[PDB]
Design a protein around this nucleic acid. Structure first.
Ligand code: K
Ligand code: MG
Ligand code: MG
Length: 217
RNA sequence: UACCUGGUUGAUCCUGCCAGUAGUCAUAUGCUUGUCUCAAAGAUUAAGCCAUGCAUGUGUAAGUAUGAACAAAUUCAGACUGU
């Protein structure tokens, strides 16, 4: 079946780690997609966003390969992006799905004004940049919906954000850079220091230290 | 009610525009057009030129009646006193 090759994979298969937030807290790299499948696999959905052909010139013509862009998300604060290039479309799509699973990140959602109910928009103004494409997200009031193009709109929908205002500059017709800028903007949500985070951090044992004895075998 | 997509390349990321998409109590034209309620309409070019018809008249007890105007009365007198 699955034979983990990493300490994190062993812990996830042994049920020692039960939530993706435990891994996110210590910023540990995730190198096996079975970890994500076990943790949040049931609620994850995938979608192929674009199949892009690329060509390399050779002495005997053009060698064509296909680029697959895949977005995964649970619609509840987790989203991932995957890009893979392969000779066959199916292989590229499979690799892109694996990479999108491996890159899932937590998305912070906040309130525009009054803080009643679940969060509905981005906590603050965030901006992402890939290549020349820059994507800006602005908090929006409840009921405003997702005001974004179809690619950013899909990325935001997979992240579970209910309403947001967006603006884009640059070559947004470069779909890869557009989606990557949106992904970077979403990732930057948890890096902004707000007054609610001013409390002193109270550290907890890392999984590799907490379960060192188990991993010692 | 804070949104983009096609097009320069063997392929790439750009600048940049062309094209698309939507709107006008916005004009015109094409095809089509069964019912109800609303409703613009010779401004744009020529404040260019105009046949014909109409679009400014007017009376109360209370300015001026002798129509040779109509009506009712008067057998005798009457300035006039109805229209
Ligand atoms: K009019
Ligand atoms: Mg604008
Ligand atoms: Mg070509």
């Amino acid at each position: 079946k699955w034979v983990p090759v990493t300490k994190l994979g062993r812990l996830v298969k042994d049920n020692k780690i039960r939530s993706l937030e435990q891994i996110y807290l210590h910023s540990l790299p995730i190198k096996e997609f079975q970890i994500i499948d076990t943790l949040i696999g049931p609620s994850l959905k995938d979608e192929v966003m674009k199949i892009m052909p690329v060509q390399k010139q050779t002495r005997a013509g053009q060698r064509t390969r296909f680029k697959a862009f895949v977005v995964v998300g649970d619609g509840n604060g987790h989203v991932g992006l995957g890009v893979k290039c392969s000779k066959e479309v199916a292989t590229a799509i499979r690799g892109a799905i694996i990479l999108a699973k491996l890159s899932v990140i937590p998305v912070r959602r906040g309130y525009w004004g009054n803080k009643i109910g679940k969060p509905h928009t981005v906590p603050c103004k965030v901006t992402g940049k890939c290549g020349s494409v820059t994507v800006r997200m602005v908090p929006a009031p409840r009921g405003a919906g997702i005001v974004a193009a179809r690619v950013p709109k899909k990325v935001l929908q997979f992240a579970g954000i209910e309403d947001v205002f967006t603006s884009s500059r640059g070559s947004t017709k470069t779909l890869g850079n557009f989606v990557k800028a949106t992904f970077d903007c979403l990732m930057k949500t948890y890096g902004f220091l707000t007054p609610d985070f001013w409390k002193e951090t109270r550290f907890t044992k890392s999984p590799f230290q907490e379960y060192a004895d188990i991993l010692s075998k």
